[PDB]
A paper describes a structure:
Here, we have characterized an exceptionally large microvirus, Ebor, and provide crucial insights into long-standing mechanistic questions. Here, we report the structural analysis of the genome delivery process of a Microviridae phage, Ebor, along with its discovery and characterization. This phage, infecting a model aquatic Alphaproteobacterium Rhodobacter capsulatus, belongs to the microvirus taxon ‘Tainavirinae’ and recognizes the host via five Gokushovirinae-like trimeric protrusions. The capsid exhibits the triangulation number of T=1, being made of 60 copies of the major capsid protein. The core of the major capsid protein contains an 8-stranded antiparallel β-barrel (single jelly-roll fold), the fold shared among all Microviridae.
We isolated two Ebor variants exhibiting different stability during cryo-EM sample preparation. Nanopore sequencing showed a single nucleotide polymorphism leading to S120R amino acid replacement in the major capsid protein. Thus, we designated these variants S120 and R120. Variant R120 virions were purified using CsCl gradient, vitrified and imaged using cryo-EM, yielding stable native particles. Single particle reconstruction produced an icosahedrally averaged map of Ebor at 3.2 Å resolution. The capsid shell has an external diameter of 28 nm and an internal diameter of 25.1 nm. A striking characteristic of the capsid is the presence of elongated protrusions situated at its three-fold symmetry axes, reaching out 9 nm from its surface. These extensions are formed by loops composed of residues 184-254 from three neighbouring subunits of the major capsid protein. The model showed the tip of the protrusion possesses a positive electrostatic potential, contrary to the negative potential of the capsid’s penton exterior.
Residue numbers in the entry:
A (entry chain B): 3 to 192, 250 to 510
B (entry chain B): 308 to 460
C (entry chain B): 257 to 307
Write the structure that this text describes.
Amino acid sequence: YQTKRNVRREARTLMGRFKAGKLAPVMAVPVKGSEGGMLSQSVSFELDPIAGRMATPITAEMCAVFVPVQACDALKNPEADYAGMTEIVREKLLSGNPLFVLEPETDVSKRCGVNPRRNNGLMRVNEIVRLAHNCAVNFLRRRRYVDAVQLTAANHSTTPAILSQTVLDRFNGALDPDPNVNGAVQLSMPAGNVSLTDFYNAQKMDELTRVMRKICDDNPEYGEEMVLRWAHGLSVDPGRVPFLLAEKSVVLGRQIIGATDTAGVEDGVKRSDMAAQLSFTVPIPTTELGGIIVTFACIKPDETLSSQPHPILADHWRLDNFVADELALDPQPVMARELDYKVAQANETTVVFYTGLNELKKTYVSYGLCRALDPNTVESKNAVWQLEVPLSVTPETVLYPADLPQYPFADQQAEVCTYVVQSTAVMPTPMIFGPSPVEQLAVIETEDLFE
Amino acid sequence: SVVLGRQIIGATDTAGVEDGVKRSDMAAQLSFTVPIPTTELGGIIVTFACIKPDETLSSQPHPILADHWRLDNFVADELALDPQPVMARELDYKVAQANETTVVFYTGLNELKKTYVSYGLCRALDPNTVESKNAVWQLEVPLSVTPETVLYP
Amino acid sequence: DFYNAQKMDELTRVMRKICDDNPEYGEEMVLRWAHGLSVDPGRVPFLLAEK
């Protein structure tokens, strides 16, 4: 066995809606052990009508994450020791009991399009779909930032979207600089001496801790543990972690339809319709046990800071001593007053994250309206749909706000988008199948042909 | 046979544009030219025509995710060499409580897993919405009962 | 029956070689081989030279 003998293929088509600013799952293709082949998926996008034209771009998203069976077991039994190991999963499968058992329906399972099973007059679906979604969204959060909030197995609803760039990553800052980089050297003083061997063992510890930072950052999964094993000369088990299959994005197009009646023409009534099409075709990974390829899709607005004080004109005009500037060689604190103007009075003077010397002046990108303009006007031409993040508080946040108001659409709380998916999978498999049966013949028994 | 084309006509008034009013018109043309058969007595060439929706099972449980996750003994799989019964619980989720465990038709070993085609809406979506863009016109056959049925409802 | 057998005779003989060609993991890899599983490689010893 473990060889390709027969073939199974699947072709699922689904339609639905999801709310903007949320990482809505679209489908979940199951993969068994020793299954590999081709997987082609395509997602259409259609948004509800928007008054006026929308110069602000809207981006589309599509992701494909392969969640192995090993990772789903860890969420099911986190406190259990060696829960995620392959052999532990391997032994439980051989026991004859099911590794994953049925559960009631949930919003996560419904959106994937897993049709339920009628058991004892109740709908039932396997727990693997819920665990796979929770692990997949967790995996995407580690990519933007390793120390990110991670969902448990108890989640039963759609999750918020994920930012494309964190505030700290934008300004390349740090909440807390380490004490080793440009650190302290021990001093003997029992007439004393700092000794020449300390500060020599250091001055590479500064170099050695920085390479330790990249090994736990280039690989967000196994982070804060592979560095432990890397120092001792050990390696992690590869199969547990998930991995990414494909990523697609495109700015939604715009089609303008104008009114023609007398009242509409005089006022200037018009419409903006958005649509997009994305697809990918990637091979299916082959594993001894198997997994699920959870697909995601999302629509997000432009991520630009409408509220950020000007680093030059907002603060005082000063003659800078460049001699002292090059002499710092140390992180400089940043207050919330420098990040936005929507700051509370108490939090105006509060260190939020450390950064370099002249950071927040190297780059300054701002998109938004003029402060003199009244937002009640330009209900037509209302193009400004941008994430009005509070900022300052939780700079390291990786997730979108739980409630994102959809201003340009008529209904804020309605699922504005409508999507149609077409997933086609061809999976060579080691499955056996069997011969087809036949139908009863009423000429042989009623005449005794085979006498 | 041919798939009917689609022509989209959109509204232009103020109320229609804001709501998103629009129309879909369908049309088709088919023809044939064949010789008339010759017979001693004769006959009648009855012509038929019909329009039907897509025939895809919107209601069918997933052969993998709906049922339990099991490690399959391929040794016993090749050893069967016999028809395996199928219950109505494996064909759809609109089954009555009594008919959940009732053999409906015998098949092979891993049938219902070789192929799985499904077209329909998401269970989370509310059908009262999308009265516009209402594209889902598919035969919602009860299934299970009368699997050998040849005729439409 | 006798058709499911007459390859069981063939199928048990291939099961004998997989547990004989590999004495280590014997009587267990045949269990995993039927279900489509594999053993962890690093545990077992192996031979270097013979003279």
